[PDB]
Design a protein around this ligand. Structure first.
Ligand SMILES: *[C@@H]1O[C@H](CO)[C@@H](O)[C@H](O)[C@H]1NC(C)=O
Ligand SMILES: *[C@@H]1O[C@H](CO)[C@@H](O)[C@H](O)[C@H]1NC(C)=O
Ligand SMILES: *[C@@H]1O[C@H](CO)[C@@H](O)[C@H](O)[C@H]1NC(C)=O
Ligand SMILES: *[C@@H]1O[C@H](CO)[C@@H](O)[C@H](O)[C@H]1NC(C)=O
Lengths: 34, 34
């Protein structure tokens, strides 16, 4: 599945996790902000 | 963590639960209403 704000959760900034990768996390809400 | 509508679910009106407390529940939709 696509990485989204629904199938994931945040905790803290990117500095502490020993292996971490840059990728987009999609948000389904803001594409219809109006 | 901040008590949002994503951390929680609703059921009844407040009168039935013994020991319930009054507090705000945050909604992360509210800033996105452009
Ligand atoms: C994983 O292994 C490779 C090859 O030994 C190494 O270059 C890399 O730094 C390791 N990654 C982590 C997160 O330690
Ligand atoms: C990940 O993204 C941040 C912010 O652009 C950048 O500082 C960092 O160097 C990037 N790391 C890699 C491996 O792309
Ligand atoms: C908890 O105990 C105190 C002391 O007896 C009492 O005043 C209070 O009403 C009780 N709270 C609940 C939620 O029953
Ligand atoms: C809780 O909030 C309601 C609505 O403002 C109020 O009627 C009730 O008296 C409050 N109870 C307490 C214990 O603050």
């Amino acid at each position: 599945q696509i990485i989204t704000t629904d199938n994931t959760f945040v905790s803290g900034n990117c500095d502490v996790v020993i292996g971490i990768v840059n990728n987009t996390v999609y948000d389904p809400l803001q594409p219809e902000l109006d």
